[PDB]
Amino acid sequence: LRPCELQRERAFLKREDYVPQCAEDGSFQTVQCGKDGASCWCVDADGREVPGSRQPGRPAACLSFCQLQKQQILLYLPQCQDSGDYSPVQCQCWCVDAEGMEVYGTRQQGRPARCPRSCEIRNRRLLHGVGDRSPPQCSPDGAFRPVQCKFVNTTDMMIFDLVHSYSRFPDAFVTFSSFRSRFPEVSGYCYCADSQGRELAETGLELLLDEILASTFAETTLYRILQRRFLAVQLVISGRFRCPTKCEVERFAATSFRHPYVPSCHPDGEYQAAQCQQGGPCWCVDSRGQEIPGTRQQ
């Protein structure tokens, strides 16, 4: 999973009277809180509490993970973006993922013009031969497509090698007819993938292919049809012709994993203007979920 969700589920199962809530992306929320919103202390990516914060309520916008690591190092220095997260290219002037750990093969003398997003990195790391040989579908901007569709070999229930099969026969992916006549025992499978490309929980939908040039299989009409069908079924499942946005994932997490902050959103899916903490203060929030520097209280 991630360094947090393990701790979170351990706390929830063991019932130990504090659950370290962490946002989607499975990284510790900068400002954790106690079992009843008593004392929200802020932490770092490691998972420890920063000594200089135990105040009851909510800390006044505790320092971000990038800058926490930076000031820890002070006693290379990261360049934290104005938002508090790492700049996409640290500076040897390599560039980094959205976690702090440098992207593998990106050590250069000068700043790269544009170095990969997360989905491009995952695809390339797949070609190196680590992970199931099915390329995650990447949005044009480079981030993960919300709906990821990976085929499955029906016999043995083993994932269907897609890099190799599409490399060898992408004539075979012209239409579903050809695919059936080439791989009759393969049944598609589409799920909703979060910002990190991690298959969300209990949202996979094992489609069928029996009854229905491009490249990458993310531009083939096969994938477009196979995700249009998934969104159509998702409309019935959840009324929204789309997968749950980052907000709604955070919501469901908080509701399930009881901890005092539960974000709020409305059917459009974006973060509601003002998020409120039961037994605590309210505050405006931007589209990306980060609390506005100060709004505690056209």
Binding site: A61, Q71, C80, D82, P293
Partner: protein, 73 residues
């Protein structure tokens, strides 16, 4: 002896003349592009400061409240 004069503007500071006064000096009088305001380890200061939406501290804004310009211009 002579002293050069510039619709354009002299990039170099004025001075009278011997010396080789620079020919390719006078050029476009650009427009203001930065405003900044001053208020009374530095990395710790800036880290704890910007975390609140933000000793000598300056908030220069590339486009009290004195105008300047981007470094190298």
């Amino acid at each position: 002896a002579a002293g050069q004069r510039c619709g354009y503007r002299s990039a170099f500071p004025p001075e009278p003349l011997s010396r080789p006064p620079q020919p390719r000096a006078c050029q476009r009088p650009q427009f203001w592009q930065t405003l900044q305001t001053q208020a009374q380890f530095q990395v710790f200061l800036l880290d704890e400061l910007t975390a609140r939406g933000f000793v000598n501290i300056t908030w220069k804004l590339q486009l009290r409240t004195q105008f300047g310009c981007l470094e190298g211009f």
